[PDB]
């Protein structure tokens, strides 16, 4: 599924992570745009052995399980085939984790590189929420 902004924002909003650790809603939906352009199935095949999954490109080294990569944690506690469904639950329950698990929203690069410093806010312009 490739979401709308102002649908994805009302979706996070729904889960919860509106201030989710002092991060404002509209970082999370810079991000997701920055990441995947808002695609669910989105999957990025890495040369280290890892893979890049779903709308926030949780990586399947430390976080998911896809059985192939070598070193994994699955901290997240599931497959990472459960990050490419439609609904967004299981990545945002496993984005809670990541950040829960020391990190800040830097473990995005894209959220580094193009959300950081900016008016994060204009992500959620005009949507009803």
Same mark, same amino acid.
């Given at each position: ?26 970082? *999370? ?11 669910? $199935?989105?999957? @990025?095949? @890495? ?9 926030? $490109?949780?990586?399947? =080294? +430390? *976080? /998911? @399980? ?7 944690? @699955? ?32 473990? +995005?690069?894209? *959220? =580094?590189?193009? /959300?950081?410093?900016?008016?994060? $806010? ?8």
């Amino acid at each position: 599924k490739v979401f709308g902004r102002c649908e994805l924002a009302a979706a996070m909003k729904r889960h919860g992570l509106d201030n989710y650790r002092g991060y404002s809603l509209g970082n *999370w939906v810079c991000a997701a745009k920055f990441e995947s352009n808002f695609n669910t $199935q989105a999957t @990025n095949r @890495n040369t280290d052995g890892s893979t890049d999954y779903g709308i926030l $490109q949780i990586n399947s =080294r +430390w *976080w /998911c @399980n896809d059985g192939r990569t070598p070193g994994s944690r @699955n901290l997240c506690n599931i497959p990472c085939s459960a990050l490419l469904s439609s609904d967004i639950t299981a990545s945002v329950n496993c984005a809670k984790k990541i950040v829960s698990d020391g990190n800040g929203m830097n473990a +995005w690069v894209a *959220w =580094r590189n193009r /959300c950081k410093g900016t008016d994060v $806010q204009a992500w959620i312009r005009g949507c009803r929420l």
